[PDB]
Design an enzyme around this catalytic site. Structure first.
Site, PDB file in Angstrom:
ATOM      1  N   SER A 123     -69.194  16.799-157.884  1.00  0.00           N
ATOM      2  CA  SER A 123     -69.315  15.337-157.850  1.00  0.00           C
ATOM      3  C   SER A 123     -70.631  14.945-157.059  1.00  0.00           C
ATOM      4  O   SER A 123     -71.641  14.422-157.452  1.00  0.00           O
ATOM      5  CB  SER A 123     -68.180  14.672-157.626  1.00  0.00           C
ATOM      6  OG  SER A 123     -67.119  14.974-158.430  1.00  0.00           O
ATOM      7  N   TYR A 144     -64.276  10.336-170.158  1.00  0.00           N
ATOM      8  CA  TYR A 144     -64.714   9.019-171.005  1.00  0.00           C
ATOM      9  C   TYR A 144     -63.515   9.120-171.797  1.00  0.00           C
ATOM     10  O   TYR A 144     -62.405   8.355-171.409  1.00  0.00           O
ATOM     11  CB  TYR A 144     -65.820   9.359-172.017  1.00  0.00           C
ATOM     12  CG  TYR A 144     -66.320   8.017-172.698  1.00  0.00           C
ATOM     13  CD1 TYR A 144     -66.526   6.852-171.998  1.00  0.00           C
ATOM     14  CD2 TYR A 144     -66.388   8.167-174.136  1.00  0.00           C
ATOM     15  CE1 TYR A 144     -66.534   5.584-172.596  1.00  0.00           C
ATOM     16  CE2 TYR A 144     -66.674   6.971-174.867  1.00  0.00           C
ATOM     17  CZ  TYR A 144     -66.810   5.434-174.036  1.00  0.00           C
ATOM     18  OH  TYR A 144     -66.959   4.542-174.585  1.00  0.00           O
ATOM     19  N   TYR A 195     -60.397  21.100-161.698  1.00  0.00           N
ATOM     20  CA  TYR A 195     -60.868  19.708-160.780  1.00  0.00           C
ATOM     21  C   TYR A 195     -60.259  18.556-161.200  1.00  0.00           C
ATOM     22  O   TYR A 195     -60.263  18.166-162.427  1.00  0.00           O
ATOM     23  CB  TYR A 195     -62.365  19.660-161.161  1.00  0.00           C
ATOM     24  CG  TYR A 195     -63.217  18.912-160.007  1.00  0.00           C
ATOM     25  CD1 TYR A 195     -64.582  18.809-160.125  1.00  0.00           C
ATOM     26  CD2 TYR A 195     -62.710  17.943-159.316  1.00  0.00           C
ATOM     27  CE1 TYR A 195     -65.385  18.317-159.089  1.00  0.00           C
ATOM     28  CE2 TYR A 195     -63.356  17.247-158.377  1.00  0.00           C
ATOM     29  CZ  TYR A 195     -64.834  17.400-158.290  1.00  0.00           C
ATOM     30  OH  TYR A 195     -65.482  16.400-157.633  1.00  0.00           O
ATOM     31  N   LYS A 213     -59.098  22.056-157.426  1.00  0.00           N
ATOM     32  CA  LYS A 213     -59.775  21.117-156.512  1.00  0.00           C
ATOM     33  C   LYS A 213     -58.924  19.713-156.713  1.00  0.00           C
ATOM     34  O   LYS A 213     -59.414  19.255-157.639  1.00  0.00           O
ATOM     35  CB  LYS A 213     -61.106  21.272-156.650  1.00  0.00           C
ATOM     36  CG  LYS A 213     -61.803  20.289-155.428  1.00  0.00           C
ATOM     37  CD  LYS A 213     -63.496  19.700-155.761  1.00  0.00           C
ATOM     38  CE  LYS A 213     -63.672  18.655-154.873  1.00  0.00           C
ATOM     39  NZ  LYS A 213     -65.134  18.401-154.904  1.00  0.00           N
TER      40      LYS A 213
END
Lengths: 298, 298, 298, 298
Positions: free
Chosen positions: C45, C108, C134, C163
């Site tokens: 990110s 989304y 993630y 993560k």
């Protein structure tokens, strides 16, 4: 099907000292009956139940029931967070002559599903009156799902309706499909003015909404046109109901706004509200007046 | 006021290989134009923009615009999270002959208000075309408020509309009031089939909603009845629109359901959807059929 | 256990014209290896993956893998909304020489659980590399529950860690109990600076967190002290990591803050970020400086 | 700074008929005083305030205050939805000899910021006692922001602390920075066991958490080690506190769990809870037992 049509959540009128105002509350009641409403709901959210003590609640219920004197069906809001008090209020309502009770889910702890089902089963079992559930997730923080409500309607035969206070066509549609699918006579009432029309078109039963207090004629005449099969006339009233809820943005809580609307539309009463609500200021009353005038409501 | 009326979010039709199916796409476009829609929106949420690469988006925009050949206004969905790409997709859409662009807010990072205003100003300045905003907070996690939309409309004169995708009377009413109050010709289109009727009665402009693809006649007939002053007729169509969205519950995402409906309602196309979407299974296709039959749609 | 310890989500350095800055990025990589980190994570990110096109991502990955030259394990963030692109980026990462991939859920559409499982299975089957999940539900709007993660670890043997980016002791504890309970060598890294210490005490494996870019010595020395049994030394570093995240409040997104801090702490790089992110202004740059100086970080 | 350190939210002990159990409650009180707590908090969430009537609450406060007999500072939770009752409970607590009151925000209506400020000001003005605010947004649905708490601390000099009940390092860090920045002796207590250590390291003052009831020694010992500058010893206690909250997952509400843990850790009392809470079943009691044994708590 019990408690269908237009059933206003009646404001409780208080004097300046915060005591039940009997002549003012009585006059509002008689205005509403005169307007053709199908029933009267005392001590809902708009009736300030959550700001009243148990004994205040009992006194108000008793006065309201006695004044109505069986002219229309009477519902009493008996819920809260203290389940023992709920039973006490629910049995008192029955003993005082109420036709039904309306029970919100506990809104401090969001109790487990097993605790929630048990809670509603035991309130239901505590009286032999009809019970209507009360979904208000914006305030409770816990939605009564159409699936859970079906479960309850399956479990207890006196669990016979719901006031579904939500700005959601999907919730209402799914509530009607899921619960009325299984229980044809289960009553689905919307909690918002601006969903009455859709509720009827979806196959639900009416509304318990704030504008029943100051503008009962709009909802009454919508329901009449709808039952007459005059869908155009119904939709004309819906157009007004679509615009009304702009006034509820004037304050939070907006029980003050509803009482000031009652005054502006022709009924002189104390507007006093119980803390932590507070008086609507003069600028916001003027703003309210112009909205009611624009809608031709006063 | 631009882009008013019924503007379907056109499904993108793909072959088994996940490649643009030109004949299937053309035939759907031609069905919708014949049905009397007011415009076509390509690469919206239902057009699978988020599962498509930039180059494939350009290919699809190109093909769609050329086939439409100016018969109805064409909108292209150019948004995403890569703002450089949004500008590239927008200028590409303008060069290719689009009549406007539809732009969602970035939906990974929910950027600060200052970054968000800048983003929208930046993309609006990148083209000389009209720009419609796209609000879909269930997917974006960030609502485009009526206050922020007004700011944008004040700020750029080519920001001229919004597709407001939300199950909320309040949000639509406040959108119309806040932004159209300030900009009388700003276009408010709802994203849900079941809010079209309310949107027109509130003073908004139409809808970009899924049923436009497989039952455009319902929304088309509704808009026409409304504009003819025949509100009962319009309400009759609304009653169908109120029920249609139960089919969308069959899968998530439900772009598969929309394409299966297109086939069931009479247009044979491949129903292939791009990963992470997946084929609708036979039991759910069977439930879709009986709902469409129950609604008299096939 | 694979990919344990301190693995910074490395910022991508770009020139003022928005292209990969190779000397800047290489020097940051070399600082971090010199600082004793256990791995490097590119295109997370913080690496701005969601603002870059597919071909830019490949180019950056190749360059980063090549510059590292097997001196520490390398992870590549290959996720997005376009699952076909995820596969093509993951297969490219393998062919380019990466040691593993990190895959966020599609952000989304929040896809059905069935679609979500299928997605991670398909991505895991596209490579013979280690797969790390993630979780970042603030951005994705969809949580990877411990139950779901355990189901994925059961399902594919190359799904071997997570993560977990959340400000929640409960989420981390339950992730470790549930998943490591069934798979003792499944790696759980926290995504926030101020949860590294707790993560280790809870039985998890390290952190991929922003401060690994500009203050990697804090995390590295914490992990060292913890493994050394010097808990008081570890807790002293923890006290610093507890205070660091107030700098992230400076902007949203805060990838600009991270780059400015790398500079402030001694490494001159270009601090350019991709839209919709924007430059940090001089006052907030100064505030950042004062926060770093307060923590003795520069 | 008032009310620092370890202040358990004491369970209210009831008999099988739901009445105050004086000898059970007195024994629990004496156990906690004897364990070295810094004060006692009666009628918090864990004390079942929300399931009790106003008169029941007054009886409990009077009995608990008289039994403590000034041995440690005593806080009474006086809040609810009925503001008039809040004032009455608060004044009664002062007249009964309490050292302070703890006041949650109203949790039915989420009142406007103006109404909310006014509510706490009038409760604070009703007593000459120290006032501690209580933030529990998971239950109230309305967060007391650090910014709003600071405005209240500025407004009223007897508003001197907060119980911040949130699984969030960010909320606690920002609460401490914002309010203690302006008011160095304003006391910040966390509401969760597993944030006590971080709270102290951040510059806060202690905890009001459920494990103070059944494992007070863990928190007391942590606080003692911290104040001794023995951070490694403090961290060893924290490792137990990190793991305790698994047990709270056993039911919702978990007031039953807390009382059963009191019994399992060595104090025989009646474990009766008020509806809509319900008795913990035999399977979950065993599970609780094994969790306590694992942490060496019994």
């Amino acid at each position: 099907a019990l408690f269908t049509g237009i059933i206003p959540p009646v404001s409780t009128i208080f004097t300046a000292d915060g005591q039940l105002d009997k002549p003012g509350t009585a006059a509002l009641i008689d205005d509403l009956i005169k307007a053709g409403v199908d029933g009267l709901f005392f001590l809902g959210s708009g009736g300030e139940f959550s700001q009243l003590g148990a004994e205040e609640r009992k006194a108000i219920a008793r006065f309201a029931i006695d004044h109505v004197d069986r002219r229309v069906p009477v519902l009493i809001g008996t819920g809260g967070t203290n389940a023992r008090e709920t039973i006490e209020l629910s049995q008192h309502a029955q003993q005082a002559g109420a036709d039904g009770i309306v029970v919100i889910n506990p809104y401090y702890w969001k109790v487990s599903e097993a605790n929630l089902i048990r809670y509603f089963e035991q309130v239901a079992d505590s009286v032999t009156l009809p019970v209507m559930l009360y979904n208000f997730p914006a305030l409770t923080g816990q939605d009564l799902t159409p699936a859970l409500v079906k479960t309850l309607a399956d479990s207890r035969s006196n669990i016979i309706g719901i006031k579904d206070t939500i700005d959601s066509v999907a919730h209402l549609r799914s509530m009607i499909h899921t619960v009325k699918g299984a229980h044809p006579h289960f009553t689905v009432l919307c909690g918002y003015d601006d969903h009455l029309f859709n509720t009827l078109l979806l196959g639900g039963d009416g509304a318990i909404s704030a504008s029943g207090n100051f503008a009962p004629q709009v909802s009454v005449n919508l329901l009449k046109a709808w039952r007459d099969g005059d869908v155009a006339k119904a939709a004309g009233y819906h157009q007004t109901l679509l615009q009304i809820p702009q006034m509820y943005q004037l304050d939070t809580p907006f029980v003050n706004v509803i009482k000031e609307a009652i005054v502006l539309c022709g009924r002189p009463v104390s507007t006093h509200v119980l803390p932590p609500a507070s008086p609507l200021d003069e600028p916001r009353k003027a703003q309210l007046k112009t909205l009611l005038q624009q809608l031709k409501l006063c």
